[PDB]
Amino acid sequence: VAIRSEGVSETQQNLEGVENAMEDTADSAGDSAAELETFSKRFKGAMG
Amino acid sequence: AAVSALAIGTAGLLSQVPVVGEAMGGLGAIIDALTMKIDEDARPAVGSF
């Protein structure tokens, strides 16, 4: 009999899923920084 | 950095060398009066004719 263990032991995974999806949102939000300095440090080429 | 350096290189030199064309142009043009005065001394020889 394993009627209880099957229902709970998935949620321990779902917890890590929430956290790893949060990390994904943070790492993906990091894309908004990826070429940021990369444009601005070039841009004095415009002024020159 | 390199394109601004190139830009500054061209800006600094074009505001120099062809503007500095005033050197060859100026000291070239000024040959005018300082050849010319061979005329003011030409008349003295006419006075000696």
Contact B3 A45 (CB under 8 A): yes
Residue of A nearest to B1 (CA): A45
Q: Give the integer Cα–Cα distance in Å for A42 and B3.
A: 9
Residues of A whose CB is below 8 A from B10:
none
DSSP string, A6-47: HHHTTHHHHHHHHHHHHHHHHHHHTHHHHTHHHHHTTTHHHH
What is chain A's alpha carbon radius of gyration, rounded to the nearest angstrom?
22
- Residue B16, SS3 per DSSP: coil
Query: What six digits make up the tokens of A25?
Result: 């949102």
Interface of A with B (CB under 8 A): 44-45, 47-48
Contact B8 A48 (CB under 8 A): yes
Name the residue type at position A16. Answer: E
- Residue A36's alpha-carbon distances to A32, A46, B3, in angstroms, are 7, 16, 20
Q: In degrees rounded to 5, what are phi and psi of residue A23? A: -60, -40
Instruction: Please name which of B3, B1, B9 lies closest in space to residue A41, comparing C-alpha atoms.
Output: B1
- Residue B12, SS3 per DSSP: helix
